[PDB]
């Protein structure tokens, strides 16, 4: 069976684990349990042939900066993730995640993924940001960041509602296999 290795990175609290678990199991995690290192496996049929997805969940915490690259060798595609309702997490795409991944994996495709899409239209979330003169990250703004960091694709999704979720992994697959 063809196999694809996909590694997911990005700031603490952005939704990396929920993204992977909602996609692979259709169940959205009830708890917020920060990750150290987890690997999941799932199969998909791609144009009539099965592909094994090896999905590598990593820690957003800076504590794990020396450990994290244990995941990187032989990666086929990265998902760099930020929350659409956390401008700090968005900035770190450029400041931290892109340069980290590229150092270890000079040629590996990167998808930029904006998470928590359901909160961009959430009134309380909008107000919480508006109180501080901020707004959610917009699709054109995310795309501009994707271009700046040389992502092969920019995608937005909600692990919670599953809107855009399948497409994130579809595009990750196509980024590797065509």
């Amino acid at each position: 069976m063809q196999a694809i290795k996909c590694v997911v990175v990005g700031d603490g609290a952005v939704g990396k684990t929920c993204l992977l678990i909602s996609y692979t199991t259709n169940a959205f995690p009830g708890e917020y349990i920060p990750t150290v290192f987890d690997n999941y496996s799932a199969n998909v049929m791609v144009d009539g042939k099965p592909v094994n997805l090896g999905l590598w969940d990593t820690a957003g915490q800076e504590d794990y900066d020396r450990l994290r690259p244990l995941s990187y060798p032989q990666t086929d595609v990265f998902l760099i993730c930020f929350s659409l309702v956390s401008p700090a997490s968005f900035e770190n795409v450029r400041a931290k995640w892109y340069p980290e991944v590229r150092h270890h994996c000079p040629h590996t495709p990167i998808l930029l993924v904006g998470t928590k899409l359901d909160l961009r239209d959430d009134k309380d979330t909008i107000e919480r940001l508006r109180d501080k003169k901020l707004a959610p990250i917009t699709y054109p703004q995310g795309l501009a960041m994707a271009r700046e960091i040389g992502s092969v694709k920019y995608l937005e999704c909600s692990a919670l509602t599953q809107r855009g979720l399948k497409t994130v992994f579809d595009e990750a697959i196509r980024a590797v296999l065509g």
Partner: peptide, 24 residues
């Protein structure tokens, strides 16, 4: 086209126990 995923397995779990200072 690409199908929905199947056959979920949680293959590796690494924890950290802050009291013992060790990975679980």
């Amino acid at each position: 086209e690409i199908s929905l995923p199947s056959d979920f397995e949680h293959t590796i779990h690494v924890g950290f126990d802050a009291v013992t200072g060790e990975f679980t």
